[PDB]
C-alpha cells in the first residue's frame, strides 16, 4: 500500500502524453496493428511473469479507486482474491453497462480501444488468479459488441490470450457475454445472477463476490475504466498515476459533459480539476454564459444536484465533492441552465429509477413508485408544501434500507433537489394554487 | 399496454412451431461451449436474443425451445424473458424505432423527436404500424448521452437528431433505403465540434515512460 | 411536547418513594417487597402473617394515617404455589394518598381478619369468602353474602366455569323452583383473542 | 410530515414496577417521609 | 346447544408440573398430551443458495 | 381528574350528620353542579374528540374508506381490541353516592385479568347495622334512603 | 466448534458462528418480525421487515440472513430499528387493497398483527384520491387455491417452496418492479400433493383455501389437536371446529413426524366427513332392501345372526379403524370362540411376531440424514408424501443419491430407475450391481419397501432377501430396513396380533362377517357363501357397506378418541372435536354393546379400562408420542414384474373412502383431466 | 341493502366479534355467483342491549 | 375509562375532558334527583318525585341526543368520547340550566 502524497497546489490540464486513451476520439485504427503502434500489448509477458503480488502492490501504490461509482479502492478488491482457493476456479468479471444517464465513456473505450480492455483483462487475471474473463454488454450495445468480439478474436489469432498467454504458460480464455438491456444488471451481484441465467435480482451482501460469486466460484467484478487503466499503471509505474490528483483521489478520470452545453463531449482529465475550468476549457462553456447556469449533476443519476453557488468553487475528486454533499460516482456531468425546469428532470429521473428497479426488496419496489407519484404531482402542482418534508422522509425511509445502492441512488437526488430548490417547489405550488383558485 | 401475463393468441401460441436454423444450431452449440458443464443456464441470455435475431420478436415457442435445449422447466425461461425489456413478447415491426426520453436527452429536445415520430408514423408509443414496418416503443437510456438526442433503429445508434434529420431518416427508411448512422452534424462520435481541444497530436507509442526494473 | 402520552407526577413519585422506603424500614419482618407501579401507586407486598399489624401500622402511625379502607380485592392466580392474592386498598385523607397492601393466600390457609382495624372489611372479606373461598379467622360473621343460599363452590375462582354448574326452573309436580343440570340453549362461543405477536418488549424481563 | 409513532407510543413507554429498596441500593452504592402533601380536612 | 359446563375453560399455567399439582389438588383425572418441544440447531445462511457442485443451488430469484 | 382543576366550585359540608344535613348537601351539590355546567358551557375549545392513537381509539369512517392502515386498526380493534400493558391500577372518582373505584389488573393480553368494582354503597350498607339500630321502623326506611344505595353496584 | 459472544438487546449470549442475528434473537427469546423468513425454506432478503441496528454500522442489517461476528451489540428495541420497520412496512402497506373484511386470512394475517405491533398508526398515502394504488389480475393457479394477486406482497415464499420442497417449478416471478406479479406466466394448474401448505406459507393470504371459502373466522375457531389417518405418516394436525361442525384441517408442528407440512389429501378431505355419512342403523329386511331401524332391534338382529352362526364367525379390519375398535373386535371374536381376524391390506406370512418386518425402522426425522436410499416398488410422493419431503430435504442438503425398482415414476427429484424385474432386487442384495457398492459405501443407507409387494406371496421372500442385505448394512443407531405402509391401521393391527391376510377370513368361510371400517372392495358377495351375514361397523357408506346385511353407523376420526399407529411406530390418539351425527356412535362402544346383547360382555366399560387392556396387550401402545427403537429385521424370487398402485395424482386422490366421499377430490380429478385433455387438444 | 339491490353484508363477522353479549350468530359460505355472503344471520333480541357496537 | 387510560399511559384531549366534566355533572344532577325523589317516596312526599323527574326526563332526552340511548349511553370510552356532540345541544342545555334553578 502507502500511495505517495501529491504536494501540488493547482491541478492543470492533462498533457497529451499523459492521456491513456490516445484513440478515444477515433482518429487511429481500433485494431491490433494500430494498438501495437499506439503502445498497447507491449511487455505484457514481463508483467505477467513478474507475479501477482507485484501487480497488486503496484495497484496499491498507484492508489486506483473504483470508477463504477462505488469509490472503493481497486487494490483492496484485487488483494481480497489473492488468498488460495481449493477446488474452485477463479473468475474476473468486467462490468460494461453504464445505464446511469449522462454516461457514454466506456462505450467509446470498447468501440475505440478494445485491446486495452483485453490487455487489462489479462493483467487483472494474472494479478487475481482468475482463469477466465467474462465481459457483460448491453443488448442495446451491438456495434461495439461486435467490435469487441472481433478484437477478442484477433487477440486469439495473435496468441496474446488463449491457452498460452504471451508465452508465460498461463491459461486465460476471455469470453464475452451479451446481456439484455437493464440498468440493474450493472450492479455486481445482479450481473452475477444475469451471468448465471437467472433474472437481475441482486444478491445480499453478507455473501461477498470474492467468497461466493459467478457459478458459485470466487470472482471479482471490475469496471472497464479500471481494467483499461491497469496496464498503463503496470507499464508507466504507480507513482506516475499517483502523480495526478490529490491524496486518496489519485489518478485520471474520463469526464463526459452533456446537457445545456455548446460542445457536449468526453475528455480525459486529471482529478481535482475545477468544474468551471473543465467546462470552459474543453466543452466551450455553458450556453448563455456562466451566469445562465442553474444546476449541475456531477456523476449521473446516482448523485444529487449542485446549485451555482456550490458549483463556483467545487473540485471534481471524491473527497471535495462528498464535502459538498454529493458523490462523484460515475463522473458524468449534466448541465442545466436557467431555461430548464428542474422538477421535470428529477421526476424523469425518479421515473427512470422506477422503471429500472428490479422489484425484489420492498422499499425500492414501492417507495420509488410513491416518489414518482409525488414528483408527478410536483410537476403538475397538485400537492401542498407539507408534502415536501414528507417526501424527504420517504428518501429517509429508502436510503440504507435496500439491497442495492439504487435505493440510495434514488433517495439522493430527491434530497439534493429539496435542499437546493425547496422555494422553487413552493413557488410552483403557489402558482398552481393561484391557477386553480380562479 | 405491456402485459406480464400471457394469454392464447393466434399471433403467439405453443401450437405455432419454431425450429432453429442449422447455422443457428451451430451458433447454439458454440454458445453452449463457453459456459461450464452443470451451469449452462447462463446460456439463455444470448440464446433468447438469438431467437430475437431469427423471428424478429419473441414468441412462446422460442421460450419452449430454449427450455427444451437447456433441459429446464418452462417457467424459468418465462420469468427471465419477462424480466428483461429487450425481449419483445409482442409482435413488432421490421424497423424498431426506439427513442430516448430520460433527461440528458430531454434537455436537447427528445420530446420534439417523439412528437415528430408520432406525427409522421401516426401512432403512439408501444404501438405497431399496420403494415408491420415501423414500431415506436421508447426505451429509457441508450447508454450514450453526449450525442443527445439519440434513437436506435434496429440496433444502429442514430445520434445528433435535429427534427429535419429525423424527417430525412423516415424519408429514407420508408423507401427501404439504408441511412448512415451516427451524429448528423459532421461530428465524429464523442468529440468536441470544430477545433480539437484534446488528443490533437500523435501518440508517443510503446516504450515511452517505461517503469524501471521491468 | 407529547400530547398523546400521559404526563406523570414527579412530586407524587418522590413522596411515594420516600414513604415506601420508610415503610420497608419500619417493618422488616412483615413487609416483603415495596414497589412503585406506573401511575404513581405504591404496592406493599407483605407476608400473610403480617396481614393484621401492618394495616394497623398504616392506621395508626403519624406519617401513615390510612383511615379509609376503600375495598379489598382478591385476584385468583392458579399457576402460583399460593393461589389467591388479596389486595387491600387504603386511602389517607390527612396526607391525601392511597396505598395497596398485597398478600398471598392458599385455598386452605387462613387470613387474620382486619375487622379489628377497619370495620368495612366486616363485609369485604365476606365477599372474598364467597367469591374465592379463603377462611378469615377471628371474623365476627363469616357467611356467603352475594351467592345463592344453596350454592356450592366459589364463583370467581378460575377453576369455576363461567356459566356455573346448575340452572333453576319452575316445576309443577313439586310446586317449587327446582335445580337442574346446566344446559345452554346456545353455548358460550369462546373467542381466541390471544396475541400471536408480542407488543411490549419491556415486560419479558 | 413530522410525526412518527415511536415518539407517540404511550403503550411502550411503560415499565415494570420499580423495587424501591433495590433502587436505593443501586443508587446509594430532616422531616420524616410522608405519602403526600398534608391536607387539613378538619 | 351444549350440556357441558367445563367445555369452555382453558386455564393458563407456566410449567406442566404446576398443572399436574393443580390437578392433583382439585382431584381431576389428568394427562399430558405432549412434552416441551426441544429445539434443533438448524444452520441458515445465504451462501448455500449459490453453491458449486452442490444440489442445494436454488433455481429461483 | 379530567379537567376539574380548570373549573371552580364549592364543596358542601354538613354539620350534624343526620338525614337533613345530607339532603341539604345533595341540594348544594346540585347547585354547584349547575355552576360547573355553566362554566363548561362558557368555555370549551375547538378540536378533536378522541385521542389519536389509532391502536387505542378506533378510526373514523373517512379514513376507513380511504386509508388502509386505519382499516387494519379497525379490524384488530373490533375483533381483539387493544393490548393493555400488564400491571395493576386503582382509579377512584367522585360518584354522587361516594367514591367509585376500579381496581383493574391486566396480564398483558386482550382481556383484563381481574376487574374489581368498589361500590360506594357497600360500606354504607355495612354500617347500616350500627346507624339504623335503636330507631323506629319508619326511621330505618328514611335511613336506607339517606345512604344512597342502588344494589346493582353493591351486588356487582 | 467454539461459541462467540454477541450482546443482543444488551444481553450476552453464546452462539454458533454460523447463526444469524434472528437465530440469536430467538435464542434469547425476542421475536424479530418477518414476512419472508421461514425456517424450512431458503433465506431471502425481499420483505426487508427484519431490519435491526447493530452498533458502529452506517445502515441497518437484515437479521434473517446476516451472520453474527464476535463483539456485536444488537439493539432490537432501538429507535432506528423501529423507524426502519415502520418505514418498510408503510411501503408494504401503500399498495395493499382494502380487502380485510373479504379476506379469509384476516384475524390471523401477519400484516394486521405486524401493523398492530411494530407498525404505524395512520397511512401517509395521500394519493388514494387520484392516481391510486395498483391492481393486478388473478391467475387460475389451481382448483385447491383461490388467488387474489392484488394482496400479494412479493415475499417469494411460494416460489421457494415449489422449487425447494414441492419439487415442480410451476410458480415463478414475472415482471419487473412495481408491476411484478408472483404467478404462472400461462393459464396452468399448479399440482403437487403439497399445494395446501402454500396456503399455510402465504403470510397475507393472497393464496387462500378454496374449500374453506368464507366459511368461518379465526378468532371464532375452536382448535382441537388431532392426528390425520388418511395417510400412513400419522401427521399431527389441528382441526377447526365451530358450533359442532368441522371446518378445516391445519398442520400442527411435530418435528419428528410432519414438521409443519400436510398433504392435499390429508387437508382437503374435511368435506368427506359431510357427505355419504351413515346416521341410522340399517338392517337388510328379507324383502331385499336395506331399511333403517332402531339401535336395539339392529343389535338383537346381529345377535340372532351370531347365535345362528354357531362357531363360524370371522372379522375383517379396515383402514380407518383405530386401535381400540380393533382390540374390541378381536376381544369379541376371541370371547365367541373365533380365532380368525383379518386386515384389508395383506402382508407376508410370519412377519407378525417381529415389529421390524412391518415398521419404518429408520425415523422419519432420521430419513433426512440418509445418504443413499433404495426404493423397492414404492412411490413415496403419493403413498406417504411427508416421507418424500424428508427425502427431498436429504436430496437437497445431504447429497442423497437414490435408485428405484419398478416402473418410471416422478419423485419430484432426479433419480435413476434400475428396472422393473424383481431379479435385480436380488442383484443389489448380491453385490454385482453398482448401486450395491453405492449402498455399501454410504454412511447412512436405507432400503424402502412398499407394502403392495409384501401383499404378494413370492415377493415375501424378496422381503427376507432384503433382510439379509440389512445384515450387511447395520450401522450404530441406524436401522436400514424400512417398510412404508399405506393405511394407518395396519401397524396397529399387527401390534395387536391381527392376521393381515384379507383372504384368510374368506378362506375361513364364516356365517356372520364383521367389516370394521373396510371400504377397500377386496371382499365381495360371490366369494362368500349364500348364508353369510356381512356386518358393517364403519362410518361411510361405500362398497364395504353396499354388501352388508346389517349396517351399524360409526364415528369418523374427528368424532372419536382413538389411537392410531403410523409407519414409524409412534402411537398417537385423536381427539373428538365434533359430535357424531344422527345415531352414529363410537365403534368400540358398538362392539361392547354387541357383547352385552349377545351375552358375553367385554371386561372394560370405560375408555381408561380399554387403555389398561391395551397395556396388558403391549406397553408401548399405552405411551403416546414416544417411539421405542425396534430390533433387527428377520427365498425363490418370482419372475413377476414390479408394479405400483399409485403412479399418478388421480389414483392418489381416490385412495381412501373419506377422500372418495368428498366433492373436492372429484373437482381436482375433473380439473386434472380437463387440463390433460386441453393439452392433448392443443398438441 | 345497496341502492343496486344487493344486500350490504359481506359476512366478515366483525359485529359478532364485538357483540358483547354474543347475540349475533353468523354462518356463511360462498354464494353461487362467487360473492362472499351470509347464509345465517341470527340476532337474539333478548340478548341484545341495543348498544350500536355492530 | 380513566382506569384503562392510566394502564395504557395515554392522554385525553381538552375537548373530551370538558365533555366528560359537563356530562359528569349532568349525571350528578340525575343521581341527586333520583336520591331526592327516592327519599321523598320513602318519607312520604309524592310530589317532588314527579316535579324533578320531568327535568330528569329532559336530561335523558339530552343523553339520547348526544349518544343515541336514553339511559345506557356507552358514550365515554377509553381515549376520549365516541362521538362529538350534535349541533344545537348548547342552546337546549343552556335553557334547561336556566330553568332548573327555579325548579329547585
Ligand atoms: C444499481 C446500480 C447500478 C450500477 N451500474 C453500474 C454499471 O452499469 N457500470 C459500472 O461500472 N458500475 C455500476 N455500478 C457500480 C457497481 O458497484 C460496480 O460493481 C462497480 O464497477 C464497482 O466499482 P469498481 O469495480 O470500479 O471498483 C452500479 C451500482 C448500482 C447500485
Ligand atoms: S434496491 Fe431495488 S433494484 Fe435493488 S434488490 Fe431492492 S428492489 Fe431490486
Ligand atoms: S392481506 Fe391482510 S392486511 Fe391485506 S386485506 Fe387481507 S387481512 Fe387485510
Ligand atoms: S403469493 Fe403469498 S407466498 Fe407467494 S410471494 Fe405473494 S405473499 Fe408470498
Ligand atoms: S353485518 Fe356484521 S358480518 Fe356483515 S358486513 Fe357488517 S360487520 Fe361484517
Ligand atoms: S346493538 Fe345489539 S346486536 Fe348490535 S352489537 Fe350491541 S348488543 Fe349486539
Ligand atoms: S439519457 Fe438518452 S441515452 Fe442516456
Ligand atoms: S425476514 Fe429478513 S428480509 Fe425478510
PDB file of C-alpha atoms in Angstrom, chain H residues 12-41:
ATOM      1  CA  UNK H  12     -66.976 -10.550   7.889  1.00  0.00           C
ATOM      2  CA  UNK H  13     -68.187 -11.336  11.458  1.00  0.00           C
ATOM      3  CA  UNK H  14     -66.834  -8.114  12.981  1.00  0.00           C
ATOM      4  CA  UNK H  15     -70.241  -7.320  14.500  1.00  0.00           C
ATOM      5  CA  UNK H  16     -70.494 -10.700  16.225  1.00  0.00           C
ATOM      6  CA  UNK H  17     -66.862 -10.402  17.362  1.00  0.00           C
ATOM      7  CA  UNK H  18     -67.735  -7.071  19.018  1.00  0.00           C
ATOM      8  CA  UNK H  19     -71.292  -8.002  20.202  1.00  0.00           C
ATOM      9  CA  UNK H  20     -70.539  -8.033  23.930  1.00  0.00           C
ATOM     10  CA  UNK H  21     -73.407 -10.308  24.978  1.00  0.00           C
ATOM     11  CA  UNK H  22     -72.846 -12.623  21.949  1.00  0.00           C
ATOM     12  CA  UNK H  23     -76.324 -12.208  20.476  1.00  0.00           C
ATOM     13  CA  UNK H  24     -75.360 -12.414  16.792  1.00  0.00           C
ATOM     14  CA  UNK H  25     -74.712 -15.796  15.157  1.00  0.00           C
ATOM     15  CA  UNK H  26     -73.271 -15.717  11.633  1.00  0.00           C
ATOM     16  CA  UNK H  27     -72.767 -18.714   9.349  1.00  0.00           C
ATOM     17  CA  UNK H  28     -71.549 -18.156   5.806  1.00  0.00           C
ATOM     18  CA  UNK H  29     -70.382 -19.824   2.613  1.00  0.00           C
ATOM     19  CA  UNK H  30     -69.540 -18.827  -0.941  1.00  0.00           C
ATOM     20  CA  UNK H  31     -72.635 -17.853  -2.915  1.00  0.00           C
ATOM     21  CA  UNK H  32     -73.321 -19.275  -6.405  1.00  0.00           C
ATOM     22  CA  UNK H  33     -72.010 -16.127  -8.123  1.00  0.00           C
ATOM     23  CA  UNK H  34     -68.798 -16.246  -6.059  1.00  0.00           C
ATOM     24  CA  UNK H  35     -69.695 -13.338  -3.776  1.00  0.00           C
ATOM     25  CA  UNK H  36     -68.988 -13.502  -0.043  1.00  0.00           C
ATOM     26  CA  UNK H  37     -72.428 -13.612   1.586  1.00  0.00           C
ATOM     27  CA  UNK H  38     -74.194 -14.888   4.688  1.00  0.00           C
ATOM     28  CA  UNK H  39     -76.451 -17.915   4.862  1.00  0.00           C
ATOM     29  CA  UNK H  40     -77.406 -17.386   8.519  1.00  0.00           C
ATOM     30  CA  UNK H  41     -77.549 -14.053  10.356  1.00  0.00           C
TER      31      UNK H  41
END
